[PDB]
Amino acid sequence: QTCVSCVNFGNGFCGDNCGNSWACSGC
Numbered sequence: 001q002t003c004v005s006c007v008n009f010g011n012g013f014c015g016d017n018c019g020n021s022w023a024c025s026g027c
Ligand SMILES: *[C@H]1O[C@H](CO)[C@@H](O)[C@H](OC)[C@@H]1O
Pocket: 001, 002, 003, 004
């Protein structure tokens, strides 16, 4: 199990890699 700063998804949303998702522009 590992988690990163920010993971992009669909080139619009981000994830904590732990189970969190939120709209982002690019960490
Ligand atoms: C967190 O680090 C892990 C190291 O093994 C890696 O497997 C995982 O890949 C989603 C994530 O980068």
